[PDB]
Amino acid sequence: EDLDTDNDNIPDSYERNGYTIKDLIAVKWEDSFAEQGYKKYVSNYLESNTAGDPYTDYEKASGSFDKAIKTEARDPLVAAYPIVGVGMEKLIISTNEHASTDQGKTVSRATTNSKTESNTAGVSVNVGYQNGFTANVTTNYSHTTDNSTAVQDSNGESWNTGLSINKGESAYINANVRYYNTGTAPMYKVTPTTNLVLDGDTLSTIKAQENQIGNNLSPGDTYPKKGLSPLALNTMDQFSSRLIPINYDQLKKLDAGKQIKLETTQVSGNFGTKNSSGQIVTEGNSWSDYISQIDSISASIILDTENESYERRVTAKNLQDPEDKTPELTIGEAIEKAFGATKKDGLLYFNDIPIDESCVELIFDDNTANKIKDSLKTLSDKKIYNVKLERGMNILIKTPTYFTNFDDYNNYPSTWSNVNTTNQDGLQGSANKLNGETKIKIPMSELKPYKRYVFSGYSKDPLTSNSIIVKIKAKEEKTDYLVPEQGYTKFSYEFETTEKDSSNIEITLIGSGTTYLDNLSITELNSTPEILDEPEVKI
Amino acid sequence: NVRYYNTGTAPMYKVTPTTNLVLDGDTLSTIKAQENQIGNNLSPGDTYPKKGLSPLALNTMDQFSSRLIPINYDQLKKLDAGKQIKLETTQVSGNFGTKNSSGQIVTEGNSWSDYISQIDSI
Amino acid sequence: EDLDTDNDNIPDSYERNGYTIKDLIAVKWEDSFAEQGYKKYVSNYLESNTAGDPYTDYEKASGSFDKAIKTEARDPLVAAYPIVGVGMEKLIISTNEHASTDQGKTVSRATTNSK
Ligand SMILES: [Ca+2]
Ligand SMILES: [Ca+2]
Ligand SMILES: [Ca+2]
Ligand SMILES: [Ca+2]
Numbered sequence: 101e102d103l104d105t106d107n108d109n110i111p112d113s114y115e116r117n118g119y120t121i122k123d124l125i126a127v128k129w130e131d132s133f134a135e136q137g138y139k140k141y142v143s144n145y146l147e148s149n150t151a152g153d154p155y156t157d158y159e160k161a162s163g164s165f166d167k168a169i170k171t172e173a174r175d176p177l178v179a180a181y182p183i184v185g186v187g188m189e190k191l192i193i194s195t196n197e198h199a200s201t202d203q204g205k206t207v208s209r210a211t212t213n214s215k216t217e218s219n220t221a222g223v224s225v226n227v228g229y230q231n232g233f234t235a236n237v238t239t240n241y242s243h244t245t246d247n248s249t250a251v252q253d254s255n256g257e258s259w260n261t262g263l264s265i266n267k268g269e270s271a272y273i274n275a276n277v278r279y280y281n282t283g284t285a286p287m288y289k290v291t292p293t294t295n296l297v298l299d300g301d302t303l304s305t306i307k308a309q310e311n312q313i314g315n316n317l318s319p320g321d322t323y324p325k326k327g328l329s330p331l332a333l334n335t336m337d338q339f340s341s342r343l344i345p346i347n348y349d350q351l352k353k354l355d356a357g358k359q360i361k362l363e364t365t366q367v368s369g370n371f372g373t374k375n376s377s378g379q380i381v382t383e384g385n386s387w388s389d390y391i392s393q394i395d396s397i398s399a400s401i402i403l404d405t406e407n408e409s410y411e412r413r414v415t416a417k418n419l420q421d422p423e424d425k426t427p428e429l430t431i432g433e434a435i436e437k438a439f440g441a442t443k444k445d446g447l448l449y450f451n452d453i454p455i456d457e458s459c460v461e462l463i464f465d466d467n468t469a470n471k472i473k474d475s476l477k478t479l480s481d482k483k484i485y486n487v488k489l490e491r492g493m494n495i496l497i498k499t500p501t502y503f504t505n506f507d508d509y510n511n512y513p514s515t516w517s518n519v520n521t522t523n524q525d526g527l528q529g530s531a532n533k534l535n536g537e538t539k540i541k542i543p544m545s546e547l548k549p550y551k552r553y554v555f556s557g558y559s560k561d562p563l564t565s566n567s568i569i570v571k572i573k574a575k576e577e578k579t580d581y582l583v584p585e586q587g588y589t590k591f592s593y594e595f596e597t598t599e600k601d602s603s604n605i606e607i608t609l610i611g612s613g614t615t616y617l618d619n620l621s622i623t624e625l626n627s628t629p630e631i632l633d634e635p636e637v638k639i
Numbered sequence: 640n641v642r643y644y645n646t647g648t649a650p651m652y653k654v655t656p657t658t659n660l661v662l663d664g665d666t667l668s669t670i671k672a673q674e675n676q677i678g679n680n681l682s683p684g685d686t687y688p689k690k691g692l693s694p695l696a697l698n699t700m701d702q703f704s705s706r707l708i709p710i711n712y713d714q715l716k717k718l719d720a721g722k723q724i725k726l727e728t729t730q731v732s733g734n735f736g737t738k739n740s741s742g743q744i745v746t747e748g749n750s751w752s753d754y755i756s757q758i759d760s761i
Numbered sequence: 762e763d764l765d766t767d768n769d770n771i772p773d774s775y776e777r778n779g780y781t782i783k784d785l786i787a788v789k790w791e792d793s794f795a796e797q798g799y800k801k802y803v804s805n806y807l808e809s810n811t812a813g814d815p816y817t818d819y820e821k822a823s824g825s826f827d828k829a830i831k832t833e834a835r836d837p838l839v840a841a842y843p844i845v846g847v848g849m850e851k852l853i854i855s856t857n858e859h860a861s862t863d864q865g866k867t868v869s870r871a872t873t874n875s876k
Contacts, residue, residue: 758813
């Protein structure tokens with residue numbers, strides 16, 4: 101009841117059942133400590149660092165480490181682990197190599213990007229949600245370090261008009277990039293190696309030069325900072341490389357809807373350890389030694405939560421081994437433990453955005469589905485959050501930009517037709533009403549120029565009534581007749597937004613039958629290709 | 640475009656292999672891992688780069704690169720005559736990790752070269 | 762029955778007939794431990810590292826080493842030993858040496874291999 105078999109300053113009996121740190125020390129967890137500010141920690145009593153990170157189960161749980169680590173990384177199951185990647189917000193292509201100006205016809209265009217698009221571009225919608233596994237699967241679940249730019253000047257003109265490249269000459273690529281960090285720890289003395297890659301070929305790989313090595317990268321912060329003039333790609337010095345050359349075919353692909361997408365293969369950095377008196381040393385402490393150790397006993401979870409990206413590592417079980425004493429954890433539990441989620445009514449609010457299997461767009465990979473699908477079989481609850489976490493799982497959360505639950509949350513910049521009363525049957529509080537025609541007019545002046553979106557929601561009619569006729573007109577028209585069922589089911593109808601601030605968007609659930617709508621969401625997934633032809637030659 | 644691998648049981652930290660691209664019996668050129676191609680991590684069962692990360696360009700043709708691998712017309716016909724290129728890594732250079740009683744893992748000075756001959760001989 | 766002639770934290774009598782690690786320590790192997798998750802380890806009682814790898818017969822058998830090593834390398838007879846090799850999945854041949862494009866007729870072809 102007082103023995104410590106791993107010398108982590110925390111007794112095993114506290115380590116097994118749960119504990120907390122009170123004023124410097126481990127104290128047993130009594131539920132009265134909750135709703136007061138203390139978190140219930142529970143770790144592995146046979147090992148020092150339950151998660152694998154450099155810090156022991158006591159340093160994390162108490163906070164006797166760097167003060168730059170996130171609050172959610174104090175849990176002995178969430179790993180202090182930085183995820184670094186490059187993003188591109190300006191593209192320059194010129195016809196010149198050395199002293200790039202004054203000798204060519206340069207074109208430069210400002211771009212925007214997103215770190216989770218390659219993950220959700222391989223998402224096939226497959227509108228069916230059969231066995232309560234109301235999730236979506238992608239083909240290539242990559243990571244948040246795979247940023248994919250999207251040029252936005254690009255009105256109708258191509259890259260050659262004003263460039264004069266015809267099948268023999270090579271333009272040269274210049275850009276202004278801006279690193280980021282979506283993990284929990286900082287990376288000291290960062291030196292990443294990124295690859296600028298077209299459809300399938302590597303134009304050139306950047307290794308951080310002498311001047312571009314940024315000494316500091318705290319989680320949630322970029323290099324340079326939020327107001328500091330992004331880095332010139334090479335800067336064309338004696339430490340720089342030769343400007344990135346591309347050929348005429350790639351030069352047409354860049355107008356053919358194929359995107360450049362930046363990928364950071366490996367990053368090189370350090371971490372900090374105190375010295376009992378506040379002396380922090382960061383030399384010799386490299387992350388490379390812990391990256392493989394951490395990722396091999398963890399489950400990668402990503403939250404997208406538009407306007408910032410988060411990625412976490414949470415330790416797992418490996419039930420096949422008896423001597424693994426890592427506490428088994430549910431997916432709903434690991435999400436809260438990794439993202440600092442609070443419980444509003446037992447629903448894992450992140451900051452105030454609702455996060456549930458019914459509220460957002462979950463995305464998995466094939467090996468995760470081949471363990472979760474055959475887990476929702478022997479369960480008294482069809483919840484995807486009540487599945488047992490195991491190493492190798494990959495879970496992505498796409499939160500919708502526009503969501504409504506008819507209870508407290510409403511994100512649409514307009515309103516619906518009507519809700520018409522105070523309903524309580526939606527599997528979460530209130531749902532919709534108004535048998536008649538229900539509409540909402542989205543200006544499209546707030547969506548994105550050439551992206552695809554998704555409309556999904558939970559719909560039911562308790563007693564076998566009419567089929568609802570949905571009508572969606574953004575770039576196409578949609579006319580579907582879905583029959584509501586006994587349990588609310590996700591429908592996930594797709595559309596596209598093009599034409600660079602086109603007229604409007606029309607989503608109408610015109611269907612009679614006294615049906616119920618709850619948790620209807622709108623979320624962007626892919627960037628749709630747009631074709632640009634430079635001149636039209638007269639004959 | 641090549642893609643390292645690891646089929647053993649341990650990881651190799653700070654990997655720097657020396658491979659030989661060899662025709663029927665002749666060495667076109669031997670690659671030693673350059674400054675940028677040295678991959679800090681190679682866990683068993685995993686490749687460098689990872690399973691979705693754009694394999695390495697052979698030389699990348701920089702100041703750290705070598706001159707592009709030249710071959711002759713006879714080899715150029717052999718490559719259509721059913722004779723294969725086959726990559727061979729002669730020696731690899733890497734490290735291993737040892738704890739320090741408190742979770743401190745050091746991987747410097749711990750080179751595998753000292754244990755490769757000792758292990759394979761018994 | 763309790764002596765250790767190699768300072769590998771595992772007594773020689775356990776080292777000769779078989780043993781396992783239970784909660785941090787060497788315990789004699791009784792066949793009831795099988796079909797439960799424990800493996801019967803048996804090593805050399807005259808040497809620290811029976812296999813030759815950098816890790817001693819106790820660090821392997823218990824797991825007090827890197828968490829990236831395979832589960833099968835905890836046996837004191839299987840050696841922690843990495844085998845690294847290069848594989849080729851794309852071949853490009855061109856008629857040019859420096860700034861390889863724009864001056865030759867390049868051909869590139871995707872390849873598959875096997876070790
Ligand atoms: Ca512990
Ligand atoms: Ca303990
Ligand atoms: Ca021994
Ligand atoms: Ca012994």
